[PDB]
Amino acid sequence: RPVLHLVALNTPVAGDIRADFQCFQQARAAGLLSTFRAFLSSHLQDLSTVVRKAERFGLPIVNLKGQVLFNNWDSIFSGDGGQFNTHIPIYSFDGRDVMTDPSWPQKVVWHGSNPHGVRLVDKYCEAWRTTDMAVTGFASPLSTGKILDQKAYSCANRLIVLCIENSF
């Protein structure tokens, strides 16, 4: 019974990240053999295109424990900001709830995308290669109940990065 898992990196990270590599390594460290890609927009890569076309409509997006977050991939980019249920835990590869655990002082997620999951070249920490304070990236405060809220955060801030199973 088909679903795609959305899991957080084990530590908050600043704007200089080797995202896809971190998702792959931590996924494998947790014993997961599926293909995880970063839930981010980057150089010539829109966030909405990360998941394969074949899995964008009928597979619910669940957390590590199987609890449903979104009914499918496509619905996240309708324009509402990817409204999800804040009463559901968002687990990291090692099993900690990003929402409650004090290890993540800022409950905000990096994304560098507009409400349609399209890349914002001037809002994604230079394609995630800088921690400079004067540079910003778009991130979403999980308190708003949205995964794609449009808020500016300095690239120096250590925030949450999610990984998504790109195919089934």
From Swiss-Prot:
TM regions (residue ranges): none
Superkingdom of origin organism: Eukaryota
Disulfide bonds: C23-C163, C125-C155
Span list, region Nonhelical region 8 (NC8): 1-168
Record's subunit section: Interacts moderately with EFEMP2.
Protein name (Swiss-Prot/TrEMBL): Restin
Organism field: Mus musculus
Gene behind the chain: Col15a1
From-to range in the entire protein, with total length: 1194 to 1361 of 1367
